[PDB]
Amino acid sequence: SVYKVLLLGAPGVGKSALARIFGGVEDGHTYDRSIVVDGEEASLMVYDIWEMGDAYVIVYSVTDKGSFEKASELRVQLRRARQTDDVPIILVGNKSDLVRSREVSVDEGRACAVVFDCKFIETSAALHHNVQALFEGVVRQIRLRR
Ligand SMILES: Nc1nc2c(ncn2[C@@H]2O[C@H](COP(=O)(O)OP(=O)(O)NP(=O)(O)O)[C@@H](O)[C@H]2O)c(=O)[nH]1
Numbered sequence: 001s002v003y004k005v006l007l008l009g010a011p012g013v014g015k016s017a018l019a020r021i022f023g024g025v026e027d028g029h030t031y032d033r034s035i036v037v038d039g040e041e042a043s044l045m046v047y048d049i050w051e052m053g054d055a056y057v058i059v060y061s062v063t064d065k066g067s068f069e070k071a072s073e074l075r076v077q078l079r080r081a082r083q084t085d086d087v088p089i090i091l092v093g094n095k096s097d098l099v100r101s102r103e104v105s106v107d108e109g110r111a112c113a114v115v116f117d118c119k120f121i122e123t124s125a126a127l128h129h130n131v132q133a134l135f136e137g138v139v140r141q142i143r144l145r146r
């Protein structure tokens with residue numbers, strides 16, 4: 001048993017980058033990596049679809065507001081097609097390192113996350129920041145809904 005995680009979002013947001021970083025000196029395009037989350041092992045199968053579904057990860061760039069709105073629409077779309085079996089959905093604002101070209105604030109993303117029933121987190125593939133945390137939250141979010 002593995003946890004299938006799909007990566008969604010607009011082009012160039014850093015979907016391939018995050019998946020690539022997640023794996024990951026081990027031994028299991030799809031990326032497989034076993035990780036210990038809260039003392040409990042869990043195998044993840046990261047799916048970079050654009051290159052079933054236990055969870056969906058919607059990635060957007062904080063330096064591109066267009067990808068942010070596109071994320072909201074995808075979140076709405078997923079909702080209106082998957083019920084119940086409401087698999088956990090995580091909103092990810094990638095490219096947090098680019099603090100000059102940022103068009104979306106941390107609060108703005110966290111706001112739309114909570115109102116649209118999403119898990120929020122900002123990551124930086126370039127800096128390997130919150131990348132781990134993201135996939136640890138995914139596993140932690142998948143469980144929360146047996
Ligand atoms: N500065 C910075 N650049 C990043 C970050 N994440 C990704 N990039 C850059 O953004 C570009 C797109 O990365 P990529 O992973 O291909 O995004 P993608 O979502 O796979 N794009 P596509 O839809 O074309 O497949 C690359 O040049 C990559 O180096 C980040 O956190 N910071």
Ligand SMILES: [Ca+2]
Pocket residue numbers: 023024025026027028032033034
């Ligand atoms: Ca691996």
Ligand SMILES: [Mg+2]
Pocket residue numbers: 015016048050051
């Ligand atoms: Mg790609």
